[PDB]
């Protein structure tokens, strides 16, 4: 078995190897990359996502989210308070302000220490989940707005023809902006490209051990657990590496820098934070190996997780028993 310790793997495809996206994903899995839940892909030196970022300040963040924390430094939840719209130019200036900027630090480890020590005492503002793309249309390789769709994968593998679309989303981050512990909708893959700015630190639990993280989360967030049988779908809970180590949960960590891709694999729980002002683009995708994960994915039916139009069809076809109850939650 390849990668039996479930380490995060880092790939350096050549420009030739970067032509066929599906083939490269299948290659990485042949080497065991999926066992980690997360992989890094460094693009060939010749590749570029677009020519410059020189004109991005005019993108609108219609609903910036202030991420307010509750709990203790290592075990907290966050709630998203909606703020007034602002442009990316306004948000970047805010991120660079004295109130919100990255503190002085020695290296990524010192910054990680400061994040876990101090996150809860601040409320950074995150521009999340903004439909759009920063890939140039002329970028033919690993262009996250040109991937094969999940609906087309389900049709090729299973013959079924469904409604729905699959488009990318932009994320504008600042110091301390945080992504809570989650897997993807329907336990899909994700791919995330850091277009510019400061790094993103990731934490990940191997898929084969995801239930260990779930059981700890039920112990640490016991009222949330009684409220919903899949409350990590709410994407609000944080647990620090120190707490994960104290409780024996297997995990890995890695820092993504500008110009790099990350892939998350089906049922790979992940969480993380931004080091400073940045912009990422991410989208869900599927392969044949996902189908079985989609069939087994948990679902939030309490009504809090409230997800896309396109997820309806996935539930309806892969999980017809759940359909009914999950749509009671979504209506
Ligand atoms: O970058 C972020 O804030 C969160 N992204 C993801 O969880 C992802 O790409 O799957
Ligand atoms: Mg612009
Ligand atoms: Ni994710
Ligand atoms: Zn729920």
- The residue ranges of every structural domain in the chain are 1-331
- For ligand 4, the distance from its centroid to the CA atom of residue 217, given in whole angstroms, is 14
- The whole-angstrom separation of Cα 98 and Cα 42 is 33
Say if residues 294 and 225 touch (Cβ distance below 8 Å).
Answer: no
Cβ 280 under 6 angstroms from ligand 1: yes
Query: Looking up tokens 């902006």, which residue turns up?
Result: 177
| CA–CA distance, 144 with 209 (Å, rounded to integer) | 29
CA of 301, nearest ligand number = 4
N-term to C-term CA, the chain: 44
Tokens of 96: 């660079």
Alpha-carbon distances of 236 from 181, 190, 220, 224, 305, rounded to whole Å: 7, 19, 13, 10, 10
Q: Pull the structure tokens for residue 323.
A: 């359909």
Atom of ligand 1 nearest to the CA of 191: 9
Solving technique for this entry? Answer: X-ray
- Assigned architecture for domain 1-331: Sandwich (2.60)
Neighbours of 239 (CB within 10 A): 24
State which ligand 1 atom lies nearest to the alpha carbon of 182: 7
184 is an annotated ligand-binding site residue: yes
CA–centroid distance, 51 to ligand 1, in Å, is: 24
Residue nearest to atom 9 of ligand 1 (CA): 192
Question: Does 228 belong to an annotated binding site?
Answer: yes
Q: Where are the alpha helices (DSSP H) in 96-227?
A: 108-118, 150-158, 210-220, 222-227
Q: What backbone torsions phi and psi does residue 162 show, to the nearest 5 degrees?
A: -140, 155
- Residue ID of nearest Cα to ligand 1 atom 3: 179
Strands 65-72 and 125-131: antiparallel
* 3-state DSSP assignment of residue 185: helix
According to the annotation, is 79 in a ligand binding site?
A: no
Assess whether the C-beta atom of 171 lies below 6 angstroms from ligand 1.
yes
Per DSSP, the residues of 95-110 read: HTSTTTSPPP-SSHHH
Is 195 among the annotated ligand-binding positions?
no
Residue 253 CA, ligand 3 centroid: distance in Å? 14
What is the 8-class DSSP label of residue 24?
H
Distances (CA, A) of 265 to 29, 83, 143, 148, 188: 10, 32, 18, 17, 7
Query: Helix (H, G, I), strand (E, B), or coil: what is residue 81?
Result: strand
- The strand pairing partners of 282, in sequence order, are 169, 192
Residue with CA nearest ligand 1 atom 10:
190
- CA 26, chain centre distance (Å): 20
Q: Which residue has the tokens 């359909």?
A: 323
């Amino acid at each position: 078995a390849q990668n039996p310790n479930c380490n995060i793997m880092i790939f350096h495809p050549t420009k030739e190897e970067f032509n066929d996206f599906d083939k490269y994903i299948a290659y990485m899995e042949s080497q065991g990359a999926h066992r980690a839940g997360l992989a890094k892909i460094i693009p060939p030196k010749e590749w570029k996502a677009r020519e410059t970022y020189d004109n991005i300040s005019e993108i609108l963040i219609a609903t910036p989210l202030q991420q307010v924390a509750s709990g203790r430094a290592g075990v907290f939840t966050q709630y998203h308070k909606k703020k007034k719209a602002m442009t990316v130019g306004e948000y970047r200036h805010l991120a660079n302000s004295k109130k919100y900027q990255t503190p002085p630090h020695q290296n990524f480890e010192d910054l990680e220490r400061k994040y876990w020590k101090n996150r809860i005492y601040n409320s950074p503002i995150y521009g999340a989940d903004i439909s759009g793309s920063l890939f140039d249309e002329n970028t033919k390789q690993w262009n996250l707005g040109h991937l094969g769709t999940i609906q087309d994968l389900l049709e090729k593998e299973c013959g079924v023809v469904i409604e729905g679309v699959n488009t990318p989303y932009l994320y504008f981050g600042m110091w301390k902006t945080t992504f809570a512990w989650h897997t993807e909708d329907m336990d899909l893959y994700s791919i995330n490209y850091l277009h510019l700015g400061e790094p993103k630190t990731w934490y990940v639990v191997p898929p084969e051990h995801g239930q260990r993280l779930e059981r700890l989360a039920r112990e640490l967030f016991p009222g949330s657990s009684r409220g919903c049988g899949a409350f990590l779908r709410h994407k609000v809970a944080l647990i620090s590496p120190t707490v994960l180590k104290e409780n024996g949960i297997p995990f890995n960590r890695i820092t993504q820098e500008a110009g790099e891709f990350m892939v998350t694999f089906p049922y790979g729980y992940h969480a993380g934070f931004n080091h400073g002002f940045n912009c990422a683009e991410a989208i869900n995708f599927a392969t044949p190996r996902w189908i079985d994960y989609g069939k087994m994915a948990s679902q939030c039916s309490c009504g809090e997780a409230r997800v896309t139009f396109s997820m309806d069809a996935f539930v309806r076809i892969l999980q017809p028993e759940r359909y009914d109850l999950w749509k009671r939650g979504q209506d």
